[PDB]
């Protein structure tokens, strides 16, 4: 039997530096985790020990920290090249800076193949990008070869900025003929590496005949066999075994997100490329693993430009940006309006003739707004100022919520009003009126929402059975601040852009801001 | 006696081409008026006939048509040089593109002196601009000399974009010592040429000892002695005689605006430089005066770049821009919101710690919105599209209105609601609620306005005795659509930027627009 060790990362999301346990900024270095310097140490150790190793990334290195803001993917090519990745699949966030922001910095500078079998280009773009990503690559591993076939979420146009000259095909439709072709070329060991989420990964394992292993991402899925090593709660065993339509057992793996874990799967293959066994577990990259000194020194050199950028003017405000708790936990506050307006702007994506934009609505818990910004520094706003407002290292995500669920969220917003608690909601594209003389659970007396399926945006009453797209913090999508109804009833969730970055981009675009309090939230 | 002919223009406001009688686009060429080619013909005729002639401009050549949008003052230097102007005073609109947009295109390219005695610079700007405008110039005229002393509205910081490195001093305070100095240098014939408005021109004539003549502007004042030749109604005789504190009669002149008239004043002086007599009248530049063929051919060559610019993309919309009458004469319409938001953005000026901005409020009659803009041309918006929405050649002006006057305007807005009449108001920085079941004059049931003297903009009830700054079309400042209360009760009026240009700049800055209908106007 021929044994392969697959090492894999996914959804690293710009966590170049080691992090806290929750993947936010490292404070107590002695307890920090992840980062590329520590990953280097562990990969190097494994490569000393195991003869046949592939290091794979299932996408979404782009977007998540000031590294991406400043270096725009150059840091991804540089540090993935230093780690000697063998292959990477395109994730949705690889399109955040458009096709141009993918071709240049990443496709042209990577020393490993970048893969996606279900993305096609037309017009002059097709000639410009031809060969810079591939449907698959056949890699030599010891005296054998292994085919790696990529895929990317069909939903990328709604979750990033790929433009109108790329088409994202159904994954299984695109993958099958490529896997069929590799069989005709005497490639009998095939890994599907891609970025569509755990549910689609299981469908690929089931339906794409000849796939031996699926290495996925996008959904930040943590899988584990045994007692888990940290705070993440497993969604299933590692690997997750799918029974394929051809009767084979097909392992499916993912490794959470944020570079906290290194996925590690050992596969035994017979002479015909059938999987005989698979076993492993992600490895928690905790402080017991030293940061590689050479990688750490290069990280510290690259950090200088981040420190310099952090104090640069992004734009100006001519108004006080009231992020005080005394405002934002009690009533509409202009910082809340700014952040929600930035959230909606960030989610302007290419539209049908069927909608002006696919999403129009935003909620933001006031407890998530952690500082005001004074306008009397010549109006200057810096990244450092925004990091004081939004210090948690979160994202502004896209969810689908029934109106009934959103009504329950607005009732929860004021269930115990008057205590300065964090659940009070700031809004965009929503007008709410409360009557606090009513019983908890029955205080929302008006709730109107901005249309999407309309050529002129206007407000309509919220409908209980209609499903609305809403931009909101990951903290709330995960049921933080008591919003259990959001976690338990949402129909879709996709992780979005870094919270600070969303607001910084909006302020940079606007140049001079003057958000008002305007009656999005009223009391009767 | 030594006789001087003073020819003068003011507030030409980018009317390079001949115009309709109302100074808008020329349609019936046989009845058109003004323009620089016709002015050239008349000035040339007068210079053949009169030995001692000065051609003066009292400011505000900048701003008013697509000429200024495209050529940014190069057209002003070019065509004023072709007409051989002798001197120009700085107007407020000469600062519309900042100091940089005055130095380059106009101060560096004019072949005549540009004057203002009451503008001072500090810091590096003082060295950069030194000598490029002057407090005064002494000009040879035949065998004599005439001093010309300039001035500019002290209010320019509220009416343009001069920046924070220029100080506009009180006109009379600045002028007196310069006029005193010219007396010490044996200059006994002195013209004050400047841009502060007819009321300040009369105060200068009264109070600045040694001024022989005041040639003014800014207020678009039409003066005439006799039966007037066109639609403009005189504010007084031409010249308007002021009795000075020293006991002299001091003529004050102005010549309307828009290049429709050439001011013409004949002055007789004694040997000591005292005015013995003054007489004249503006000359209506009607179609009986031929356009100079050479100037007209140069105008037609410069027009090519305007035609090319007119069809260029300024920005995009992802929403239908509903400028229909069926919307904008009946209810809040998103085109109205866009235009009012552009109006407020245009009027962001440097602020005290006393206000976030000096003005926060906008009204716009729905009858002034003449087309929608379809978003299905790949979202493109062009100047030509905006000219269909705003076809009248107006400006968006700054007025001061008591709350009582603004309440009466909102009652007038709906006095005969339901007939598709033009007076229905679109708004910005104002939230109004009507009850149309009430009697005409008593239909406004709520009227809230955005604060200015506040660090966080928020809405307060309108106060009847408080004076509010409001941006609105010149058509409404002049009492159009039955808004007689605005004309008759306003406390201040200053002419603003060209209507199309205001919206074009805003769309260019925003890049992608998506204005909503959001409850600025409601019905109960
Ligand atoms: O990741 C986080 C953690 C807390 N929070 C907010 O912080 C609040 C706690 O703030 P406080 O203890 O300082 O009152 C909590 O109620 C939330 O609203 C977030 O928004 N995101
Ligand atoms: O300079 C002008 C002339 C008319 N108008 C508007 O045009 C309206 C007349 O339009 P109508 O005749 O097409 O109904 C008038 O009631 C005003 O609202 C302006 O706004 N500006
Ligand atoms: Ca196989
Ligand atoms: Ca004199
Ligand atoms: Zn991701
Ligand atoms: Zn993803
Ligand atoms: Zn003017
Ligand atoms: Zn003026």
Coordinates of N, CA, C and O in Angstrom, one line a residue, chain A residues 309-360:
Chain A
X309 N 0.7 52.2 7.9 CA -0.7 52.4 7.3 C -1.7 52.7 8.3 O -2.6 53.5 8.1
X310 N -1.6 52.1 9.5 CA -2.6 52.1 10.6 C -2.9 53.5 11.1 O -4.0 53.7 11.6
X311 N -1.9 54.4 10.9 CA -2.1 55.8 11.4 C -2.3 56.8 10.2 O -2.4 58.0 10.5
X312 N -2.4 56.3 9.0 CA -2.7 57.2 7.8 C -4.1 57.7 7.8 O -5.0 56.9 8.2
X313 N -4.4 58.8 7.3 CA -5.8 59.3 7.1 C -6.4 58.4 6.0 O -5.9 58.4 4.8
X314 N -7.6 57.9 6.3 CA -8.4 57.2 5.3 C -9.4 58.1 4.6 O -9.8 57.8 3.5
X315 N -9.8 59.1 5.4 CA -10.9 60.0 5.0 C -11.2 61.0 6.1 O -10.5 60.9 7.1
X316 N -12.2 61.8 5.9 CA -12.6 62.8 6.9 C -14.0 62.6 7.3 O -14.9 62.2 6.5
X317 N -14.3 63.0 8.6 CA -15.7 63.2 9.1 C -15.8 64.7 9.5 O -14.9 65.2 10.1
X318 N -16.9 65.3 9.1 CA -17.3 66.6 9.6 C -18.2 66.6 10.7 O -18.7 67.6 11.3
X319 N -18.6 65.4 11.1 CA -19.6 65.2 12.3 C -18.8 64.3 13.3 O -18.0 63.5 13.0
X320 N -19.2 64.5 14.6 CA -18.8 63.5 15.6 C -19.5 62.2 15.3 O -20.6 62.1 14.9
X321 N -18.6 61.2 15.4 CA -19.1 59.8 15.1 C -19.5 59.2 16.5 O -18.6 58.7 17.2
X322 N -20.7 59.2 16.8 CA -21.2 58.8 18.1 C -21.4 57.3 18.2 O -22.4 56.8 17.9
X323 N -20.3 56.7 18.6 CA -20.2 55.2 19.0 C -20.3 55.0 20.5 O -19.8 54.0 20.9
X324 N -20.8 56.0 21.3 CA -20.9 55.8 22.7 C -22.0 54.8 23.0 O -22.9 54.6 22.3
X325 N -21.8 54.0 24.1 CA -22.8 53.1 24.5 C -24.1 53.8 25.0 O -25.2 53.2 24.7
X326 N -24.0 55.0 25.6 CA -25.1 55.7 26.0 C -26.1 56.1 24.9 O -27.3 56.2 25.1
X327 N -25.5 56.2 23.7 CA -26.3 56.4 22.5 C -26.7 55.0 21.8 O -27.9 54.7 21.7
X328 N -25.7 54.3 21.5 CA -25.9 53.1 20.6 C -26.5 51.9 21.3 O -27.0 51.0 20.5
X329 N -26.6 51.8 22.6 CA -27.4 50.8 23.3 C -28.8 51.3 23.7 O -29.5 50.5 24.2
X330 N -29.2 52.5 23.3 CA -30.4 53.1 23.7 C -31.3 53.6 22.5 O -32.5 53.8 22.7
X331 N -30.7 54.0 21.4 CA -31.4 54.7 20.4 C -30.6 54.6 19.1 O -29.4 54.2 19.1
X332 N -31.1 55.1 18.0 CA -30.3 55.2 16.7 C -29.1 56.1 17.0 O -29.2 57.2 17.6
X333 N -27.9 55.7 16.6 CA -26.7 56.4 16.8 C -26.0 56.5 15.4 O -26.1 55.6 14.6
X334 N -25.4 57.7 15.2 CA -24.9 57.9 13.8 C -23.7 57.0 13.5 O -23.5 56.7 12.3
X335 N -22.9 56.5 14.4 CA -21.9 55.5 14.1 C -22.6 54.2 13.6 O -22.0 53.6 12.7
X336 N -23.7 53.8 14.2 CA -24.4 52.6 13.8 C -24.9 52.8 12.4 O -24.7 51.9 11.5
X337 N -25.4 53.9 12.0 CA -25.9 54.2 10.7 C -24.7 54.1 9.7 O -24.9 53.5 8.6
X338 N -23.6 54.7 10.0 CA -22.4 54.7 9.2 C -22.0 53.2 8.9 O -21.7 52.9 7.7
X339 N -21.9 52.4 10.0 CA -21.4 51.1 9.8 C -22.4 50.2 9.0 O -21.9 49.5 8.1
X340 N -23.6 50.3 9.2 CA -24.6 49.6 8.4 C -24.6 50.1 7.0 O -24.8 49.3 6.0
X341 N -24.4 51.4 6.7 CA -24.3 51.9 5.3 C -23.1 51.3 4.7 O -23.2 51.0 3.5
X342 N -22.0 51.3 5.4 CA -20.8 50.6 4.8 C -21.0 49.2 4.5 O -20.6 48.7 3.5
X343 N -21.7 48.5 5.4 CA -22.1 47.0 5.2 C -22.9 46.9 3.9 O -22.6 46.0 3.1
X344 N -23.9 47.7 3.7 CA -24.7 47.5 2.5 C -23.8 47.9 1.3 O -23.9 47.1 0.3
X345 N -23.0 48.9 1.3 CA -22.2 49.3 0.2 C -21.2 48.2 -0.2 O -21.0 47.9 -1.4
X346 N -20.7 47.5 0.8 CA -19.7 46.4 0.6 C -20.4 45.2 -0.2 O -19.7 44.4 -0.8
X347 N -21.7 45.1 0.0 CA -22.5 44.0 -0.6 C -23.2 44.4 -1.8 O -24.2 43.7 -2.2
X348 N -22.8 45.5 -2.5 CA -23.3 45.8 -3.8 C -22.6 44.8 -4.8 O -21.4 44.9 -4.9
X349 N -23.4 44.0 -5.4 CA -22.9 42.9 -6.3 C -23.7 43.1 -7.6 O -24.8 43.6 -7.7
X350 N -23.2 42.4 -8.7 CA -23.9 42.5 -10.0 C -25.3 41.9 -9.9 O -25.5 40.8 -9.2
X351 N -26.3 42.7 -10.5 CA -27.7 42.4 -10.4 C -28.3 42.1 -11.7 O -28.0 42.9 -12.6
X352 N -29.2 41.1 -11.8 CA -30.3 40.9 -12.7 C -31.0 42.3 -13.1 O -30.7 43.3 -12.5
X353 N -31.9 42.2 -14.0 CA -33.0 43.2 -14.1 C -34.0 42.9 -13.0 O -35.0 43.6 -13.0
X354 N -33.7 41.9 -12.1 CA -34.8 41.5 -11.1 C -34.6 42.2 -9.8 O -35.4 42.0 -9.0
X355 N -33.5 42.8 -9.6 CA -33.2 43.6 -8.3 C -32.2 44.7 -8.5 O -31.4 44.6 -9.4
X356 N -32.4 45.8 -7.8 CA -31.4 46.8 -7.9 C -30.1 46.4 -7.2 O -29.0 46.7 -7.6
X357 N -30.2 45.6 -6.1 CA -29.1 44.9 -5.5 C -29.8 43.7 -4.8 O -30.9 43.8 -4.3
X358 N -29.0 42.7 -4.6 CA -29.6 41.4 -4.0 C -29.9 41.6 -2.5 O -30.6 40.8 -2.0
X359 N -29.2 42.5 -1.8 CA -29.4 42.7 -0.4 C -29.5 44.3 -0.1 O -28.8 45.1 -0.7
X360 N -30.4 44.6 0.8 CA -30.7 46.0 1.2 C -30.7 46.3 2.6 O -31.0 47.4 3.0

